Amino acid sequence: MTEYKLVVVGAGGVGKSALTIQLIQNHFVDEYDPTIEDSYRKQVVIDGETCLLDILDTAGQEEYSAMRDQYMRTGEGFLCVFAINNTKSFEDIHQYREQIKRVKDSDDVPMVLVGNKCDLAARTVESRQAQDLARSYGIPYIETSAKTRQGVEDAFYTLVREIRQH
Ligand SMILES: Nc1nc2c(ncn2[C@@H]2O[C@H](COP(=O)(O)OP(=O)(O)NP(=O)(O)O)[C@@H](O)[C@H]2O)c(=O)[nH]1
Numbered sequence: 001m002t003e004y005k006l007v008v009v010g011a012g013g014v015g016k017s018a019l020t021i022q023l024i025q026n027h028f029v030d031e032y033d034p035t036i037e038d039s040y041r042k043q044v045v046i047d048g049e050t051c052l053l054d055i056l057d058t059a060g061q062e063e064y065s066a067m068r069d070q071y072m073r074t075g076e077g078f079l080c081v082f083a084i085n086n087t088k089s090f091e092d093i094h095q096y097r098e099q100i101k102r103v104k105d106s107d108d109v110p111m112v113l114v115g116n117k118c119d120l121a122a123r124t125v126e127s128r129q130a131q132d133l134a135r136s137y138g139i140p141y142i143e144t145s146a147k148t149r150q151g152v153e154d155a156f157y158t159l160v161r162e163i164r165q166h
């Protein structure tokens with residue numbers, strides 16, 4: 001069975017753990033819920049393929065940046081997750097994509113840009129400029145809401161498709 005090693009990157013609080021738990025466990029978490037599992041596994045069906053998903057859930061804080069260089073190196077695809085209500089997290093996508101190309105030694109790693117927290121009305125990152133940042137990266141863009149399950153599978157499965165196409 002094909003195993004897709006996925007790594008969730010992005011600034012702190014954008015919903016990296018929420019997107020991961022909503023995919024593997026079908027349950028939404030907030031600040032009060034534990035998010036220290038880091039490593040996840042689940043058998044899913046993507047485009048008719050029954051496969052195994054290895055989700056490497058990383059922390060977004062700069063304290064764990066040196067810890068992100070060690071793991072995620074063994075990752076194949078990456079979800080560059082930001083929050084549509086936080087403009088800094090969207091422009092922080094710059095330093096995370098650049099941190100993956102330096103661990104991968106490659107300009108085109110299987111990658112995906114994720115705009116999370118779409119349920120909230122206080123959008124500060126218009127989808128237009130997010131679709132353009134992902135287009136300039138040459139990677140797909142997925143708008144998600146880990147709170148309402150919308151786009152959650154679309155983000156992880158499209159990144160898996162990115163791995164296949166690479
Ligand atoms: N409304 C809404 N809130 C969300 C969504 N995803 C995450 N959140 C909220 O954002 C906060 C951070 O969630 P979390 O998944 O831990 O984000 P994180 O990027 O993993 N943080 P860290 O980098 O420290 O691991 C929580 O309060 C959570 O409820 C979403 O899609 N919608």
Ligand SMILES: C1CNCCNCCNCCN1
Pocket residue numbers: 012031035059060061
């Ligand atoms: C709350 C949940 N923590 C996830 C892992 N991060 C360690 C530091 N985070 C600060 C608040 N983040």
Ligand SMILES: [Mg+2]
Pocket residue numbers: 016017018035058059
């Ligand atoms: Mg987290």
Ligand SMILES: [Zn+2]
Pocket residue numbers: 012013059060
């Ligand atoms: Zn945290």
